Design a binder for this molecule. Structure first.
Ligand SMILES: Nc1ncnc2c1ncn2[C@@H]1O[C@H](COP(=O)(O)OP(=O)(O)OP(O)(O)=S)[C@@H](O)[C@H]1O
Lengths: 181, 192
């Protein structure tokens, strides 16, 4: 039950990505440290093991989406891919923040114990940026209002997920151990 | 041309002209000759500030060589009518009518710059026509001269006979002499 090393996973990504050295080091070390944190589960001498998410930045067509997809092939824990452009501030017509967790369970076949150990990716984060330049009465929803909702999600807390496509049964799913890119 | 400035507020940024920015702080500018158009504009500003805040002092900067008398008297009654104390400052020069609005300010809130100069004289006029019409306009301009001296004594504290003798001809008063004359209260040499 030997886990992969940063060098082994890096060579695996080299066969699908070209011209990106610094970005490979981040995902390799983060994914490597992820397995160690979940494997220990505050059972070793190290108590209250923290978390470290990743923020990828680059021009369009640079290969950000490729690293998220190619990484999932070698990855054992599940993986998903969503977009925050459609997200709203808990009640508007567009979407809800918990939709991300719904797509995550489809890949894990509704396994809460296995989904918490998974990985999540977000695309088109620039659309969430402040729109109104020190906002006014309009109460921006697509922008600032979305960031504040994600705050608790990235840190870790319980949530609510529909079991089979609802919008009277809700399952609790922690997110402190879940990684976000 | 007038430069534009940006004011930082909680709601957002706002572009204001240099004159409109100062107006928001209860500051009025009196520049050039006193005429019917410029005087009617200052009255609207004073009335607007009265409604916005009746307990805050107004700042009135006076730098003008004087002008029409009737245009200036409309401002004098307005300053005395409204409740707020209209603070007056003399910048550059203060002629006959410019000086009258300076001394007409609230008592104790009148200042003059260290190099300013005040000038006071009698009303100017003229007429051309029949002798009967000259007598009518002559009696009228004489009443104005008498009325302007009565009010000048009221704010300056001097006697009516003293103001009459000094206003027969042009009389220049430097900034220190204006304090001794009761026209102003002090000088704003430096900031404290
Ligand atoms: N470094 C790369 N090596 C090989 N193919 C690449 C590389 N970068 C981009 N591609 C190709 O470009 C396609 C799209 O890559 P993306 O990751 O979507 O680019 P992008 O920078 O993520 O654009 P976004 O995420 O929509 S802003 C991939 O499916 C590859 O075919």
């Amino acid at each position: 039950s030997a886990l992969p090393t940063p060098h082994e996973i890096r060579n695996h990504l080299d066969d699908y990505v070209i011209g990106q050295e610094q970005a490979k080091k981040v995902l390799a070390v983060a994914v490597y440290n992820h397995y160690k944190r979940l494997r220990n589960g505050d059972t070793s001498n190290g108590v209250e093991l923290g978390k470290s998410n990743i923020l990828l930045i680059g021009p369009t067509g640079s290969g950000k989406t490729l690293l998220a997809e190619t990484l999932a092939r070698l990855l054992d824990v599940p993986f998903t891919m969503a977009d925050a452009t459609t997200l709203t501030e808990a009640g508007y017509v567009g979407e809800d923040v918990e939709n991300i967790i719904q797509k995550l369970l489809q890949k894990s076949d509704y396994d809460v114990q296995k989904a918490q150990r998974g990985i999540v990716y977000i695309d088109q984060i620039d659309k969430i940026s402040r729109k109104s330049d020190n906002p006014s009465i309009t109460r921006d929803v697509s922008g600032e209002g979305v960031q504040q909702a994600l705050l608790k999600l990235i840190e870790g807390t319980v949530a609510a997920v529909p079991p089979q496509g609802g919008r009277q049964e809700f399952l609790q799913v922690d997110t402190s151990k879940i990684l976000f890119i | 041309l007038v430069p534009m400035v940006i004011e930082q507020t909680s709601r957002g940024e706002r572009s204001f002209d240099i004159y409109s920015r100062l107006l928001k702080e209860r500051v009025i500018f009196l520049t050039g000759q006193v005429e019917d158009h410029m005087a009617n504009l200052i009255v609207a500003q004073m009335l607007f500030l009265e409604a916005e805040n009746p307990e805050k002092d107004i700042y009135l900067y006076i730098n003008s060589p004087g002008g029409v008398i009737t245009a200036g008297m409309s401002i004098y009654d307005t300053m005395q009518f409204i409740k707020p104390d209209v603070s007056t400052i003399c910048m550059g020069q203060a002629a006959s009518m410019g000086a009258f609005l300076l001394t007409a300010g609230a008592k104790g809130k009148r200042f003059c710059l260290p190099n300013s100069r005040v000038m006071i004289h009698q009303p100017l006029g003229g007429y051309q026509g029949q002798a009967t019409d000259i007598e009518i306009h002559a009696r009228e301009i004489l009443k104005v001269k008498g009325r302007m001296n009565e009010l000048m004594a009221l704010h300056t504290g001097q006697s009516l006979e003293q103001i009459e003798r000094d206003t027969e001809r042009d009389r220049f008063l430097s900034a220190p002499e204006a304090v001794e004359y009761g026209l102003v209260d002090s000088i704003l040499t430096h900031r404290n």
